[PDB]
Amino acid sequence: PRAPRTYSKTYSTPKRPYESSRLDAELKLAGEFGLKNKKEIYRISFQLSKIRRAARDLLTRDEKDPKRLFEGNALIRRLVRVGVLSEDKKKLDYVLALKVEDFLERRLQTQVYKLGLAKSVHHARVLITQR
């Protein structure tokens, strides 16, 4: 008898199971940004899934509707605030757009490489984890 420690999981695994094309693309994305799982991709594309979802749902509501404005602007400002969404396309018909790579390009893994400091994505992995 204590408050239920809540949770929820953080990934969405592939509908189809053995799709060559998608597998290729996955292994690519892993091999660029230095990831170990396909799950590390699943998780990402899932966050993407929910986000784009509420985007659609907001965009069915009427323009200049209270919810649409509050949560729309909130979502946008949030996305940008960590640097995934472009300042230019700052009105959520491009948050509906987006894509996965754009999400990937914000990882500490990656940034610790983009500005040198590692010269190798895997060196990024190991350096990061090693204090």
């Binding site: 204590r2 408050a3 509050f70």
Partner: protein
């Protein structure tokens, strides 16, 4: 279920107490008294969760059992004393004087008041009757019983109270156009002058309200507390003066006050 319940689980506990989910499994169960369970504020919540004056519960019993706190006049030695709306929590030491009053969010707020406003109180006369030996009386929402009141004193009126003695020093009727603090509903906390009473014989009389921001709304007469004249209040309201800014209004205000 064979008798009365003497425990209170968390999550059962009224949300307007603002307790956190973990940290245990129960909350303090309000005792019996002046204010109803589902709409009060036990001394321990206040002295621990609102003021952060004591860290434990043990320390609240420690403080209390030394008569530092006194309620509406008297001392009170009940960790879970049911303190509620319109009351007065005095700290004799520390020099501090509190009136228990609601937010706009509908929560009980800490609110610092004067040494002198802490000498009296306001009580909505919930009932007015005739008693033994002819003595009429009036009884107020905090369970005050006052013998011999002004015959003009009805039901749904409000009343200024000595605290020093008991007696009523002045009373405000329930008329079209009078300052009203809403106790209960979603519009609990808002304050808005009164437009007009929808009668409805037999059940649930309605009260039409509008604040000083030309916004309207409606609540049961049940949940209406007469507190004065347009602009002229009879006690020190708290910040925000119960006006209810929109989600947008508060996103802008809270995020305009941003310069360091």
């Amino acid at each position: 279920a064979r008798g009365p319940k003497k425990h209170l689980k968390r999550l059962a506990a009224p949300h307007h107490w603002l307790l956190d989910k973990l940290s245990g499994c129960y909350a303090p169960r309000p005792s019996a008294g002046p204010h109803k369970l589902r709409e009060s504020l036990p001394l321990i919540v206040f002295l621990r969760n609102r003021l952060k004056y004591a860290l434990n519960g043990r320390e609240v019993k420690a403080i209390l059992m030394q008569r530092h706190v006194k309620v509406d006049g008297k001392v009170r030695t009940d960790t879970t004393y049911p303190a509620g709306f319109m009351d007065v929590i005095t700290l004799d030491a520390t020099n501090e004087n509190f009136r228990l009053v609601y937010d706009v969010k509908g929560r009980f707020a800490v609110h610092r008041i004067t040494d002198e406003e802490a000498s009296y109180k306001l009580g909505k006369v919930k009932k007015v009757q005739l008693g033994k030996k002819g003595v009429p009386y009036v009884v107020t929402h905090d369970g005050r019983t006052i013998r011999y009141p002004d015959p003009n004193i009805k039901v749904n009126d409000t009343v200024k109270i000595d605290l020093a003695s008991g007696k009523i020093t002045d009373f405000i009727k329930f008329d079209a156009g009078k300052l009203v603090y809403v106790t209960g509903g979603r519009n609990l906390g808002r304050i808005g002058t009164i437009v007009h009473k929808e009668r409805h014989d037999g059940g649930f009389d309605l009260v039409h309200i509008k604040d000083s921001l030309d916004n309207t709304f409606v609540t049961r007469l049940n949940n209406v507390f007469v507190i004065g004249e347009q602009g002229k209040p009879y006690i020190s309201l708290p910040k925000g003066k119960g006006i209810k800014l929109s989600i947008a209004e508060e996103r802008d205000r809270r995020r305009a006050q941003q310069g360091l």
